[PDB]
């Protein structure tokens, strides 16, 4: 059949690429072969994790066999080892298959038999398709998957859904093609129909799924990309199998653009509960544009430039600001207060238990900086903020985010947060920082400007040595391709930069804020970060009234924070948004904003909105909440 041969060709053509997207894998294996256990130093027949390792290692060797640049490309002895490995596995599998137990090991360790093993059959059979082993591999696949994966969604007496089913459908479909069924026939099967529903990813307005502004929500109300990351590699298969209509590709691509980067750096607030800024696959999911992205409802602003990746997760009362579990409960400050740019050519330094409490933007309430929000259940618990109102405005190269938040579980911490991303830096102002009165035991708070894991050796001197070398000033302190500066604003208290080590693993540049001002919710801090080698003359101003903050980057980008409104102007384009999510904007708000940035007589025309009452109304507020005007 043409269909089968074409699929096998496509599979081999795209294997290396597909493998680069696959979350669970063993890359470039060189483990020695063993006629008893498939590979040396493993006990796969008694230990199910070891069987998983055998499975992954075999798949890894398939990729090596198939990879033109690999030293073992089309190597006949590897081909033999692969078919021999499959034979060994087949000789261990019970016939008939078990009903609702694992064939060996703990009765509940079914995973590698249902998920990973069928992928082994598929990978071995296809990569060996031009060898003398093909017909045997195909026959073993037809028989053994016929038993262990009888439908797309059933294995060993269990019905499967979600992530599990997305994995299963790929080798199942292939097994049916080997049996001579056409893709049109397979499509109509009940199991495949369930999977097609699972992979549709329609936009949703609440609950689990892809939200309307392309941020993935899991566990009812948590920003969480794990579900997408784990099964992403399967999407290309289903699109090949069943066509360009089965998956919301635009929605998913935008979802990845909204949080990821080619280097694999991802804002921690949308990642796993242990606190992480890295995925070893997300960089391979899509080709990323150089752009500023915003999710106006879910509250994410992300910029990818030629020099940096920067992102802020905002706060809305509609979504959890944090999720903890029995092990992980110190990650809330990182999820709520990370205000950082990462140099794209910098070292990817990920967090650990001793460093996860510290990052540019984090407000610390104690010297050691540990803030715990324990799970009140025997598994996970997510927490809604007491206050969560966020506005985002973006133009070509710049994006601003304005957050008003209050967190009951972090000692009633509240703040107004103003962030601006531009080429090549980031402005951050916190004002009205507050905590529960009389709660800090006479300990001053602090806002982290720069942080470093001291176990990492770079060519940067220590923060204290840099300070002393700079006439005892922490201005221009550098770490990992990022440089920090204090940003004074006349009539706003902005503390000086000082250096401190909160524990033996971390050094900080911070702005210390008095417990007295925190008690009155009047504490403030202001700094900027630059990509090393890329300085600017950014200035910020408090214009006449409280909360009216004008930032002139000095490169053509102007921004205004005037809670609840935020505005960015660049070239002939202006964007506004309200943290109240107003779908109308008054003429007077526009006029006052333009006056505040020093351009009182600006002429303008609506781009995505229309005259309605005493202002403008959005043409469409379904996905986006920014009013866009052209300066005419």
UniProtKB/Swiss-Prot annotation:
Transition state stabilizer, annotated site positions: 273
Transmembrane segments: none
Location(s) in or outside the cell: Virion membrane; Host nucleus; Host cytoplasm
Keyword hit for Transmembrane: no
GO cellular component, one term: virion membrane
Superkingdom of origin: Viruses
Membrane listed as a keyword: yes
Pfam families: Baculo_E66, Lyase_8_N
SUPFAM superfamilies, alphabetized: Chondroitin AC/alginate lyase
GO MF, one annotated term: lyase activity
InterPro entries: Baculo_ODV-E66_core, Chondroitin_lyas, Lyase_8_alpha_N, ODV-E66_C_baculovirus
Site (Important for catalytic activity): 323
Keywords: Host cytoplasm, Host nucleus, Lyase, Membrane, Signal, Viral envelope protein, Virion
Active site location: 164, 219, 227
Its EC number(s): 4.2.2.-
Result of changing residue 227 to F: Complete loss of non-sulfated chondroitin degrading activity
Family as reported in the entry's similarity comment: Belongs to the baculoviridae E66 family.
Function: Component of the polyhedra envelope. Plays an essential role in oral infectivity. May digest, with its chondroitin lyase activity, the chondroitin sulfate barrier of the peritrophic matrix of the host midgut to facilitate viral infection in the epithelial cells.
Protein name: Non-sulfated chondroitin lyase E66
């Amino acid at each position: 059949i043409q269909e089968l041969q074409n699929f096998e060709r496509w599979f081999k053509n795209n294997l290396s690429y597909s493998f680069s997207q696959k979350a669970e894998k063993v890359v470039n294996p060189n483990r020695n072969w063993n006629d008893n256990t498939v590979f040396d130093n493993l006990s796969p027949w008694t230990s199910v994790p070891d069987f998983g390792t055998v499975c992954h290692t075999l798949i890894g060797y398939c990729v090596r066999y198939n990879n033109t640049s690999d030293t073992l490309y089309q190597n006949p002895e590897l081909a033999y080892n692969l078919i021999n490995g499959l034979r060994i596995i087949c000789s261990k599998l019970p016939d008939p298959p078990p009903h609702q137990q694992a064939p060996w090991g703990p009765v509940a360790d079914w995973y590698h038999f249902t998920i990973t093993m069928p992928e082994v059959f598929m990978n071995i059979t296809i990569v060996l398709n031009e060898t003398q082993h093909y017909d045997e591999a195909a026959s073993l696949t037809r028989y053994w998957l016929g038993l262990y994966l009888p439908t797309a969604v059933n294995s060993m007496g269990w019905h499967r859904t979600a992530g599990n089913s997305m994995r299963m459908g790929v080798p199942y479909t292939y097994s049916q093609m080997l049996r001579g069924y056409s893709l049109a026939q397979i499509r109509q099967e009940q199991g495949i129909q369930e999977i097609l529903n699972t992979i549709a990813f329609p936009y949703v307005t609440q609950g689990n799924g892809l939200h309307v502004d392309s941020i993935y929500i899991d566990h009812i109300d948590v920003r969480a990309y794990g579900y997408l990351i784990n099964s992403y590699f399967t999407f290309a298969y289903y699109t090949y199998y069943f066509g360009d209509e089965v998956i919301n590709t635009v929605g998913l691509t935008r979802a990845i653009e909204n949080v990821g980067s080619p280097e694999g750096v991802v804002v921690p607030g949308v990642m796993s509960r242990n606190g992480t800024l890295y995925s070893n696959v997300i960089g391979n999911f899509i080709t990323y544009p150089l752009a500023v992205h915003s999710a106006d409802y879910s509250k994410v602003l992300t910029k990818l430039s030629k020099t940096y990746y920067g992102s802020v997760v905002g706060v809305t009362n509609r979504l959890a600001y944090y999720e903890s579990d029995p092990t992980n409960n110190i990650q809330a400050p990182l999820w709520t207060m990370a205000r950082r740019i990462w140099n794209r050519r910098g070292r990817i330094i990920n967090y650990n238990a001793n460093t996860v409490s510290f990052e540019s933007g984090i407000i610390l309430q104690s010297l050691n900086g540990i803030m715990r929000i324990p799970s009140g259940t025997t598994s996970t618990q997510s927490f809604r903020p007491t206050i969560g109102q966020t506005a985002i405005a973006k133009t070509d190269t710049a994006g601003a985010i304005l957050v008003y938040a209050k967190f009951a579980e972090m000692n009633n911490l509240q703040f107004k947060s103003c962030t601006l991303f531009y080429d090549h830096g980031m402005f951050q102002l916190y004002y009205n920082i507050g905590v529960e009165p009389n709660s800090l035991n006479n300990t001053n708070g602090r806002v982290i400007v720069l942080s470093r894991d001291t176990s990492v050796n770079t060519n940067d001197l220590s923060f204290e040595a840099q300070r002393i070398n700079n006439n005892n000033s922490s201005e221009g302190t550098t770490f990992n391709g990022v440089v920090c500066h204090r940003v004074p604003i006349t009539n706003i208290n902005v503390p000086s930069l000082t250096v401190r080590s909160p524990n033996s693993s971390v050094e900080l540049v911070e702005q210390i804020i008095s417990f007295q001002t925190m008690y009155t919710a009047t504490a403030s801090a202001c700094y900027k970060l630059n990509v090393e080698g890329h300085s600017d003359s950014l200035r910020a101003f408090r214009v006449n009234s409280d909360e009216n903050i004008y930032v002139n980057v000095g490169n053509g980008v102007k921004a205004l924070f005037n809670y609840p409104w935020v505005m960015v102007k660049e070239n002939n384009k202006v964007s506004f948004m309200s943290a109240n999510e107003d779908t109308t904007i008054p003429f007077s708000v526009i006029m006052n904003s333009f006056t505040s940035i020093g351009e009182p007589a600006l002429q303008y025309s609506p781009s995505n909105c229309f005259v309605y009452g005493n202002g403008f109304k959005l043409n469409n507020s379904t996905f986006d909440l920014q009013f866009i005007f052209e300066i005419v």
